[PDB]
């Protein structure tokens, strides 16, 4: 009945607990201390952080809870607009864009993106093939180069050419700085405001120019030529721009974090790495992986799912109660009460996964049938789940599969896991050496 609550800060209540550079991990330690649910209060804000599958399976009842825009999503909405990720379910543009964009994100649609994914993946492999001896790989940086370029290429046929850059493309600097200012608003400036508005324009300018500039096998074509079957309407240019920005943000950093965490866990678990490398070598028999071959990388996907279990890179999503309801038979929620799903804690629910929740064992996912309902939510829930899941998983499987095929990896620094937190999670400073296996492309 009585809901736990972490330490308060007088008038600021719990909000200064988010005044930290690792708020998800701070929220996880609070959840470790307080359990499956704890009230988090701030001035003018009350939310509840769910950490058990028991409560989250109820939160994932779409008849009772709908996606809420967390404060982070509302700040991302300042430039992602009514794009898919930052729109309310009841906004016309969500379901409209959902229906228009769902076919271009199916498992059937990955066949058309695969060649462009391979394009960037080959650039990643070639970059590492071209490293000198004792030179190392900055993993999250290269993973971000790879995923951002992949979504740029697969999304609207735009080459950010991140592997040709030290400082990212001006759009990327603005997007990250806009995302940074959005996150700093959580923890919370006239200069930051002007910069944010400048970064919004930089982002808008490039996308709207690309929408104006633009048939290819990319999301942009589907958004210009796609009609929502329901309303019969195509997305207007403004929403198309919000979707591209949405896809640029949503589709690069969570996927790079997953790859970066996957490789981190691979180099920390040589048995898993060997097992995944053996599959990559066995399955990727061609110089260029095919779509079908990426599907055969079962264990690689198992590695990716276990990396998503330990560190879901989009580490939370928000829900609101559509009507007065009771959560778990002891937490009454009024209409509009907000819930936060602490995904990394959910994925450490010992009552679901056993006591070895902190162990990286992809064998947990050997049979996806053994996973209870709503125990594993790295891609959100229901109709508001990640539309790019298949895209992210296909890209990450392909790229990790190519990485494992072409290189032996060394944790040469014995890297101490340091999870930098933006709105996503990444192992900061994670560096490896890759000894090429000298397998041509």
Please list the active-site residues.
254, 379, 386
**C-beta closer to a copy of itself: residue 163 or 291:** 291
Give the shortest CB-98-to-ligand HEM separation in angstroms: 5
Give the shortest CB-112-to-ligand HEM separation in angstroms: 13
Q: Give me the 374-413 binding string for a copy of itself, x by CB under 8 A, dash otherwise.
A: --------xx-x----x-----------------------
* 388 interacts with, out of ligand HEM, a copy of itself, none, CB within 5 to 8 A per kind: ligand HEM
CA 350 to chain centre: 23
Helix (H) or strand (E) holding 37: strand 37-42
Within residues 276-305, the interface with a copy of itself by CB under 8 A covers 278-279, 282, 292, 295-296, 298-299
Q: How, if at all, do strands 338-342 and 45-50 pair?
A: parallel
**C-beta closer to a copy of itself: residue 199 or 349:** 349
Contact 128, 139 (CB under 8 A): no
Written as six digits, the tokens of 40 are 């988090």
CB atoms within 10 A of CB 46: 12
Contact 114, 143 (CB under 8 A): no
What contacts 162, CB < 8 A, 6 or more positions away?
144, 145, 146, 148, 149, 168, 169, 172
Residue 102 main-chain phi, psi, to 5 deg: -55, -45
Long-range CB contacts (within 8 A, 24+) of 277-280: 277/404, 277/405, 277/408, 279/401, 279/404, 280/400, 280/401, 280/402, 280/403, 280/404, 280/405
Contact 383, 245 (CB under 8 A): no
Q: Does 423 engage in binding with a copy of itself (CB under 8 A)?
A: no
What contacts 112, CB < 8 A, 6 or more positions away?
217
Q: How, if at all, do strands 137-138 and 316-321 pair?
A: unpaired
Q: In this structure, is the dihedral angle defined by the CA atoms of residues 211, 153, 310 and 260, taken in order, positive or negative?
A: negative
**C-beta closer to a copy of itself: residue 188 or 282:** 282
**163-202 as b/e, with b when 16 or more CB fall inside 10 Å?**
eeeeebbebbebbbbbbbbbbebbeeeeeeeebbeebbeb
49 is in an annotated binding site: yes
Give the shortest CB-371-to-a copy of itself separation in angstroms: 8
**C-beta closer to ligand HEM: residue 6 or 315:** 315
331 is in an annotated binding site: no
Give the shortest CB-65-to-a copy of itself separation in angstroms: 12
* 292 interacts with, out of a copy of itself, ligand HEM, none, CB within 5 to 8 A per kind: a copy of itself
Q: Which residue among 168, 362, 378, 427 contacts a copy of itself (CB under 8 A)? A: 362
**C-beta closer to ligand HEM: residue 230 or 330:** 230
By the criterion CB under 6 A, which residues form the site for ligand HEM? 67, 73, 84-85, 94, 98, 151, 246-247, 250-251, 254-255, 258, 308, 312-314, 317-318, 378-380, 384, 386-388, 391-392
Applying CB under 8 A, the span of 102-110, 217-225, 235-243, 247-255 interacting with a copy of itself comes to 102-110
Residues of each annotated binding site for (9Z)-hexadecenoate = 49
Residues of each annotated binding site = 49, 386
**Chain contacts with a copy of itself (rule: CB under 8 A):** 57, 61, 63, 98, 102-103, 106-108, 269, 271-272, 275, 278-279, 282, 292, 295-296, 298-299, 351-352, 354-355, 361-363, 367-370, 372-373, 382-383, 385, 390
């Amino acid at each position: 009945k009585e809901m736990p609550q972490p330490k308060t800060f007088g008038e600021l209540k719990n909000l200064p607990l988010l005044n930290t550079d690792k708020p998800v991990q701070a929220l996880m330690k609070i959840a470790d201390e307080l359990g499956e649910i704890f009230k988090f209060e701030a001035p003018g804000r009350v939310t509840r952080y769910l950490s058990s599958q028991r409560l989250i399976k109820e939160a994932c009842d779409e008849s009772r809870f709908d996606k809420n825009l967390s404060q982070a999503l509302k700040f991302v909405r300042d430039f992602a607009g009514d794009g898919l990720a930052t729109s309310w379910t009841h906004e016309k543009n969500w379901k409209k864009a959902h229906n228009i964009l769902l076919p271009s994100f199916s498992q059937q649609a990955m066949k058309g993106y695969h060649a462009m994914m391979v394009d960037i993946a080959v650039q990643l492999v070639q970059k590492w093939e071209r490293l000198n001896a004792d030179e190392h790989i900055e993993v999250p940086e290269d993973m971000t180069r790879l995923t951002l370029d992949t979504i740029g290429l697969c999304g609207f046929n735009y080459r950010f050419n991140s592997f040709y850059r030290d400082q990212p493309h001006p759009f990327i600097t603005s997007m990250v700085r806009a995302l940074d200012e959005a996150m700093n608003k959580l923890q919370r400036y006239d200069e930051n405001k002007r910069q944010f508005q400048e970064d919004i324009k930089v982002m808008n300018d490039l996308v709207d120019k690309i929408i104006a500039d633009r048939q290819s096998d990319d999301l942009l074509t589907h958004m210009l030529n796609g009609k929502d079957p329901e309303t019969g309407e195509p997305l207007d240019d403004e929403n198309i721009r919000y979707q591209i920005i949405t896809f640029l943000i949503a589709g690069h950093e969570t996927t790079s974090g997953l790859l970066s965490f996957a490789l981190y866990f691979l180099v920390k678990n040589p048995h898993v790495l060997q097992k995944a490398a053996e599959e990559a070598a066995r399955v990727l028999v061609d110089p260029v992986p095919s779509y079908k071959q990426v599907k055969q990388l079962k264990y690689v996907g198992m590695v990716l799912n276990e990396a998503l279990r330990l560190w879901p890179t989009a580490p939370a999503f928000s829900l609101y109660a559509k009507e007065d309801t009771v959560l778990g038979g002891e937490y009454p929620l009024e209409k509009g009460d907000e819930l936060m799903v602490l995904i990394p804690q959910l994925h450490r629910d010992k009552t679901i996964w056993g006591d070895d929740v902190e162990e990286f064992r992809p064998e947990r996912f050997e049979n996806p049938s053994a996973i209870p309902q709503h125990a594993f939510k790295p891609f959100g829930n229901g109709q508001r789940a990640c539309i790019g899941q298949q895209f992210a998983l296909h890209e990450a499987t392909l790229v990790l599969g190519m990485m494992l095929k072409h290189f032996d990896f060394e944790d040469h620094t014995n890297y101490e896991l340091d999870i930098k937190e933006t709105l996503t999670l990444k192992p900061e400073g994670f560096v490896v050496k890759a000894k090429s296996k000298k397998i041509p492309l």
